[PDB]
A paper describes a structure:
To study the influence of this N-terminal region on the crystallization of XopAI, we produced an N-terminal-truncated protein, XopAI-ΔN70 (by deleting the first 70 residues) and grew the crystals. The crystals belong to space group P21, and they diffract with a resolution of 2.26 Å. The structure of XopAI-ΔN70 was solved via molecular replacement. In XopAI-ΔN70 crystals, the asymmetric unit contains four copies of the protein. However, we did not observe a thread-like and tandem protein packing in XopAI-ΔN70 crystals. This result suggests that the intermolecular association of the central cleft and the N-terminal sequence is responsible for the observed tandem packing in the crystals of the full-length XopAI protein. More interestingly, the coordinates of the central cleft in the XopAI-ΔN70 crystals show that these residues still have similar sidechain conformations in the absence of the Arg peptide. The loop structure found in the P41212 peptide-bound state is in a stretched conformation, whereas that in the monomer D of the ΔN70 crystal structure is in a contracted conformation. For example, the central cleft in the P41212 peptide-bound state has a volume of 722 Å3; however, that in the monomer D of the ΔN70 crystal structure has a volume of 159 Å3. When mapping these structures onto the energy landscape, we found that three monomers share a similar PN loop structure near well C, whereas the other one has a distinct loop structure near well E. Unlike apo structures, the peptide-bound structures constitute a discontinuous energy landscape.
XopAI, encoded by XAC3230 in Xac, is a putative type III effector composed of 296 amino acids. XopAI resembles a bent right hand, and it can be dissected as a two-lobe structure with an N-terminal α-helical lobe (residues 74 to 193), and a C-terminal β-sandwich lobe (residues 194 to 296). XopAI possesses a highly negatively charged surface at its central cleft, whereas a positively charged surface is required for interacting electrostatically with the negatively charged phosphate group of NAD+ in mARTs. From analyses of the crystal packing, we found that XopAI uses an altered mART domain to bind its own N-terminal peptide containing a conserved Arg residue.
Author numbering: 73 to 296
Write the structure that this text describes.
Amino acid sequence: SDLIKQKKQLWQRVQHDGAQFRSTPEERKQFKTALITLWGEQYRPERQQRWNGMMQRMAQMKWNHPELKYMATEDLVALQAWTTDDYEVVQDVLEKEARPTAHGLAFAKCIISALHSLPEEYSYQGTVFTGEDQLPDWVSERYQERSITTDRRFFAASETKNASWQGMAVEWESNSTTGKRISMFSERPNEQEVLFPPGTRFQVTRIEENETHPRLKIYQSQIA
C-alpha cells in the first residue's frame, strides 16, 4: 500500500535523524489512536482506559523525576506499551521483509522518540542479555562475525539473567554503551529491560554454535 512507502520513509528518517529522532504532535495523536484501536472496535473502551491510565502514570513519573520533564508523556507511554503484548506489532515493523501496518509504524515513531529523548543517565553501560527463538538463517542474514550489524529491529535485552530469563535457541551478549534502561517505565520493572532502537549498530565479534540450547550465542558490542 502506501504503508510500504511510509516504512522506507521512516527507515530513512531513523538513519538520517539518528539520536535527534523526535515524534511530532500528530505522530503522538496517531500513536494514541493506533494503541486504542489495536485490538479492534470492541476493545476501544477498555484500551482507552488503559491509555488514560498510562498517561496519568507517566505524567506523575515526570513530576517525581524532573530529568524527564521535557519527554513527551505519550513517548513515555510508548515505552510502557512496549513492555505489554503490543510489542509484537512493532518490533519487526522496519525489517526489510516485514509487512508494515499503520499501527506498527505509529508505535515505532514514539518508541524511537522516547529512547533518544531519555537523558543519558538512563543508559546502561555493560553486557545485556537477550534470548529469542530464531532460525539459523535468520541469524546468518543479520549477524556475521567481525562484521557490523545495523539492527532494524527494536532489540530488547536485560541487565540481568533474572527470574524473567528462560533459555532460548538464540542468545546475545551485547555490550551496551547507550542502550536505555526502561524498567522504571515497564509494567514488570524487575525484568530490568534494556531497549535498543532500530538503527543501532553492533560490532559482532564472535558467534558460538551448540547443538544444545543456545544453538547460537552472539557476542556483539554497540558502537557509535
